[PDB]
Paper text:
After extensive cryo-EM screening (detailed in Materials and methods), we obtained SAM- and SAH-bound [name] complexes and determined their structures at average resolutions of 2.6 Å and 2.8 Å, respectively. As the two structures are almost identical, for simplicity we focused on the higher-resolution SAM-bound [name] complex and described the structures of the components in detail. The SAM-bound [name] complex overall exhibits an “L” shape architecture, with [name]–[name] and p1–p2 perpendicular to each other. Specifically, [name] shows extensive contacts with [name] on one side, while on the other side the [name] N-terminal helix (NH) protrudes from the direction perpendicular to the surfaces of [name] and [name] and directly interacts with p1 and p2. The co-factor substrate SAM is found in the MTase domain of [name]. Specifically, the SAM molecule is positioned at the end of [name] β2, β7, and β8, facing the conserved DPPW catalytic motif (residues 209–212) in [name]. The adenine moiety of SAM is recognized by the side chain of D182 and the main chain of V183 in [name]. The hydroxyl groups of ribose are surrounded by [name] N370, E371, and R357. Several residues, including D209, S332, and N360, directly contact the methionine moiety of SAM. In [name], SAM is not found and an eroded NALW motif is observed instead of the conventional catalytic DPPW motif.
The [name] [name] complex consisting of four subunits, namely [name], [name], p1, and p2, is the first identified eukaryotic 6mA methyltransferase (MTase) complex. The [name] complex comprises four protein subunits, namely [name], [name], p1, and p230. Both [name] and [name] contain the MT-A70 domain that is widely involved in eukaryotic RNA m6A modification, but only [name] contains the conserved catalytic DPPW motif, which is reminiscent of the heterodimeric RNA m6A MTase subunits METTL3 and METTL1433–35. Neither [name] nor [name] has a nucleic acid binding domain, and p1 and p2, two homeobox-like DNA-binding proteins, are required for the [name] complex’s MTase activity. Coupled with biochemical characterization, we revealed that [name] serves as the catalytic core, [name], [name], and p1 likely accommodate the substrate DNA, and p2 may facilitate the stabilization of [name].
Residue numbers in the entry:
A (entry chain A): 98 to 227, 318 to 369, 375 to 449
B (entry chain D): 11 to 132
C (entry chain C): 152 to 183
D (entry chain B): 140 to 215, 226 to 372
Amino acid sequence: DNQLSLLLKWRNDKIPLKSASETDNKCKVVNVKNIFKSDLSKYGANLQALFINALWKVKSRKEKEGLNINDLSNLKIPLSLMKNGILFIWSEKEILGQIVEIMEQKGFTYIENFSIMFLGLNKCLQSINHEKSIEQVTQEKKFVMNNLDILKSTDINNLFLRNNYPYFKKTRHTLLMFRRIGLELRHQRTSDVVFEVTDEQDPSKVDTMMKEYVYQMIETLLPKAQFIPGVDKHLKMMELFASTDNYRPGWISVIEK
Amino acid sequence: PLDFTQYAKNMRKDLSNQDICLEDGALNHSYFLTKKGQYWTPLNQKALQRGIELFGVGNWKEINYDEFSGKANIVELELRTCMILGINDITEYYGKKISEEEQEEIKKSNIAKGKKENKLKD
Amino acid sequence: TLEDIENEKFTNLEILTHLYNLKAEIVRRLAE
Amino acid sequence: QGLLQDIEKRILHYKQLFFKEQNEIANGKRSMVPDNSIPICSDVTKLNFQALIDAQMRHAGKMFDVIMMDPPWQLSAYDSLSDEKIQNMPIQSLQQDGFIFVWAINAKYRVTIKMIENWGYKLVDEITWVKKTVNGKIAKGHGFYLQHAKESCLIGVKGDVDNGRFKKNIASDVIFSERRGQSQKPEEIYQYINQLCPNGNYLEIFARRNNLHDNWVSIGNEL
Ligand SMILES: C[S@+](CC[C@H](N)C(=O)[O-])C[C@H]1O[C@@H](n2cnc3c(N)ncnc32)[C@H](O)[C@@H]1O
């Protein structure tokens, strides 16, 4: 049938949302007026990973705010900052070619891709029966995940999300990966495709419990950039456009403020 | 244009092989009912009949030497000769020169045997 | 290897994918 | 010996089946290939593309609306072509106002974007085909950083493409369908193209006989 008991199993497994760590030696928080206009060579050196949690301002996202693709070109990544490592970036459908060309003009070669397949929660709720806040959406998602054996007879193509786009309806959100060669990678442990039940208002803004999935993917892809206490005197992972509340241990959080 | 039957006929006449299109522009469905490179053309049938009238049933080594069909499958040669003669047992019809068959008509009208598949049975 | 000759689906002409040469294999094996 | 007798009996049986099949074909037995399809057998390098263009002008009066390519990349196939030879194709002449559908592998994602740019197209979309199993689960795969479970169809566009014969905001950019024979694209791509361009002129390059459809001009070595 749907097999949604297996396509949504990660949302009931041993993946909880991780509690933030206060300002100590395990995490470092930097407040900058603009990363795209500032020199990052001093905040961290020899970065083994660089995740750019970029929300893009495109025509697809209507009446929203976000970064601009033309502003990524003048982002200096010095060699001392970044010798060997992978750069992670969220991609829309309008700017994939611009992203890949801009990253090629800096020294990074496209290596991979990662997409999220979106199932609507309204469709799942309606199949189960026969402005929302984040806690309300969380409890609705918990309700959907509980009654996961009533909508098992439904056709999965009838539950997919179909958002408006000029050419084909939007059903996925993709993360591009680029690599610079001057890493002790762990290779095949996460699939390119993950299934998520999401609210339809703005699926680009990935929420917790799925951002945790991305963090776990990145941190199992790079098992030697972890900050072991005492052993390492500097952090090795940097995440730009961080959340001001959750400071992940072992990372450098850069928040625009 | 708003006529895909006639448009397909004309395009197949001008840009497709003679083994893929008919004279009027229709698909040669026999070509697509067989694997590529194994289609028996009417030219092959004419060459087979010409070789039969030239040399007879006999052995098929000579017909594969002078290459009337372009180095075709010899098994198809001693299979499609049975269709014209009407008997799946041509052992007694060995080495006979025939121009007009005169045998298919008489050997396809035997009611004692089974006239199945437009052919008499051994 | 007698049954494997026809397990795969072929075209009508190809179904004798080795009976083509088995036609002479039988003759040679009857010769000696 | 007994094996000779069994072989002779099997020969007689398959001979009878053979004879019945060609009798049926001579009667007028139709084929799985649809009518109204225009198959062309040639090599694309040796092809006289001017003749094809002139025929398309003579009959249809205008060039193709959707072009689909599944290029033979130098990744392993057994009939590959160089990237410059594929770039040397006169794709700029076969189309002026319409879409192009190029199936790109991960190793050839960047060069596919580059060729689509060089041919005069703008990369605007991309359809992901997620492979399903018979049970309905995700089919796994192999990669270097991650496991591959999808294939990419990069979609460029050039010229006036909204002129009353292309449809916007039609179908999902995800195909969740079972894996058919090797290297065979899902059948729903043709339905999506029908939703995109109803009853138009389509050209597909590097075609096989299983890709033959109504209204589709197809070019290939085996087709
Ligand atoms: C990599 S494509 C995949 C086949 C097809 N796209 C499908 O979905 O089944 C392989 C086909 O390309 C065709 N091909 C290879 N070289 C060609 C050439 N130089 N010109 C035209 N077709 C070619 C061959 O006929 C082969 O069947």
